[PDB]
């Protein structure tokens, strides 16, 4: 199926007490593994799988990494707020990371944001930075004049990005390659005198990617479908749903088995 | 374990064109540096290839094969003043620098 | 740029040694490299930023701090005839990306009984 790897960095700018300065988050597909704050100032394992795979000298290295990396995010939040003319406390985030789709293909992505939104956007394959405004448009014109980071990113994304998610992914696999069937039920109900709400409802899931919907007999979507979130059930899986009100049927898809219950 | 390859010494002559090769054999790549020092001096950046291909920087280029995990750094037009190290240096997972031993240049006039 | 001191020094053996790294193009990363006949050049210590350091691959018989971006001193404490070397200092803006080494000098360290 579908797998992913990805690094997060977020800084805050004068943080409350409790709140830390800096913290990096790795995730394969959606699962933490690996974490880093300027607190601990320690890069540590989040899932067993990596803890019993990775020698010491892993975390040691990538530690003095985001040591560096913490120092620089902490200045360029600065340096963006000073553009912005902006004061008191606002965020900074990196996202960087890649897919390895099912059907072999794969995908790159580098990305910023400030105070959570959109601010600059890594091509790989145009090598060139979007950028939402002139302040990032600033940044965009130092970043583009560096043609030897820009190759390295892309290199990073393409090649190392898909060699660690491989890695990781065997790590893992008795978690991340399993599956756990859905648990599906019809429910029906009259509410408001006269209308009859359905609803279809998942729990139990792994993975947490499932296709579910409403069709009228025979076979056409209709109409307006009521979407529930796939949401963590705690144990691993997960747990969602979807409805509608009045022959129909659910239909539910989920790792290569298509289900339909009948009304 | 990981390896940087890149001959001892290589000798060519004046005016003509030499080719100094570098292997490598590392878990991952982030990319190829190569040094130039003149004896008893500090070394010098020369080039920085990470993606395929040939980068030319006056008379000389350096090449890359990411999937034949070499480089060359490639000087043409020998001059006796070439007489130098070349050191070759791969950035590997970990984004650490593993150096080569050094491939010293001998021009014959 | 970058520059080291002493660019030479003789030492007897069992002596506490110091030598000075700076530079001034505000580099966040700083490395010592011994270089030996025959070696490709090996890191010692580095440091990717002020605050920090990390031991390279022969850290051994030396230390280093780095209380201050500008600084990176490499000391021995107690010298040994096999660190007569030559030692070069080398900074990068930042550590593991494209950005290339500036080296300083660097020191020819003689160690002898």
């Known amino acids: 199926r579908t797998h992913s790897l990805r690094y997060f960095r977020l800084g805050v700018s004068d943080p409350i007490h409790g709140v830390p300065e800096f913290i990096s988050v790795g995730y394969v597909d959606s699962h933490p593994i690996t974490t880093y704050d300027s607190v601990t100032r320690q890069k540590e394992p989040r899932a067993p799988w990596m803890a019993e795979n990775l020698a010491p000298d892993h975390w040691e290295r990538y530690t003095q990494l985001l040591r560096g990396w913490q120092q620089m995010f902490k200045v360029e939040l600065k340096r963006l707020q000073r553009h912005y003319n902006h004061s008191g406390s606002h965020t900074y985030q990196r996202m960087i990371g890649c897919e390895l789709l099912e059907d072999g293909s794969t995908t790159g992505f580098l990305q910023y944001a400030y105070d959570g939104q959109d601010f600059l956007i890594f091509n790989k394959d145009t090598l060139s930075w979007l950028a939402v405004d002139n302040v990032a448009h600033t940044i965009k014109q130092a970043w583009e004049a560096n043609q030897h980071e820009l190759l390295y990113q892309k290199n990073w994304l393409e090649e190392e990005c898909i060699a660690w998610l491989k890695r990781f992914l065997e790590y893992g696999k008795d978690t991340l390659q399993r599956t756990e069937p859905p648990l599906v039920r019809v429910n029906r109900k009259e509410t408001f005198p006269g209308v009859t709400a359905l609803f279809c409802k998942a729990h139990g899931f792994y993975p947490p990617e499932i296709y579910m919907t409403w069709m009228k007999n025979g076979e056409e979507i209709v109409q307006e479908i009521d979407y529930g979130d796939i949401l963590p059930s705690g144990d691993g899986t997960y747990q969602a749903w979807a409805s509608i009100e009045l022959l129909y049927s659910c239909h539910v898809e989920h790792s290569g088995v298509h289900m339909v219950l009948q009304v | 374990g990981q390896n940087i390859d890149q001959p001892t010494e290589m000798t060519a002559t004046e005016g003509a064109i030499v080719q100094i090769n570098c292997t490598y054999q590392?878990?991952?790549?982030?990319?190829l540096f190569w040094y130039q020092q003149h004896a008893g001096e500090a070394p010098t950046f020369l080039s920085y290839?990470?993606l395929d291909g040939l980068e030319e920087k006056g008379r000389f280029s350096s090449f890359l094969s990411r999937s034949k995990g070499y480089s060359y750094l490639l000087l043409k037009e020998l001059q006796m003043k070439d007489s130098a190290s070349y050191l070759c240096?791969?950035?590997?997972?970990?984004?650490?620098?593993?150096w080569g031993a050094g491939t010293k240049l001998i021009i014959k006039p | 740029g970058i520059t080291q001191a002493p660019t030479s020094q003789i030492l007897a053996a069992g002596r506490r040694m110091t030598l000075r790294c700076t530079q001034d193009?505000?580099?966040?990363?700083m490395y010592w490299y011994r270089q030996d006949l025959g070696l490709g050049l090996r890191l010692i210590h580095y440091?990717?930023?002020?605050?920090?350091?990390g031991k390279g691959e022969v850290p051994d018989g030396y230390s280093v701090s780095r209380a201050n971006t500008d600084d990176f001193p490499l000391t021995l404490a107690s010298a040994v005839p096999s660190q007569t070397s030559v030692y070069f200092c080398?900074?990068?803006?930042?550590?593991?990306?494209?950005?290339?080494?500036?080296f300083g000098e660097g020191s020819r360290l003689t160690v002898l009984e």
């Open positions: 240096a791969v950035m590997d997972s970990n984004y650490q620098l593993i």
């Open positions: 590392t878990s991952g790549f982030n990319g």
């Open positions: 290839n990470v």
């Open positions: 193009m505000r580099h966040n990363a």
């Open positions: 440091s990717n930023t002020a605050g920090t350091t």
């Open positions: 080398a900074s990068s803006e930042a550590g593991g990306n494209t950005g290339e080494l500036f």
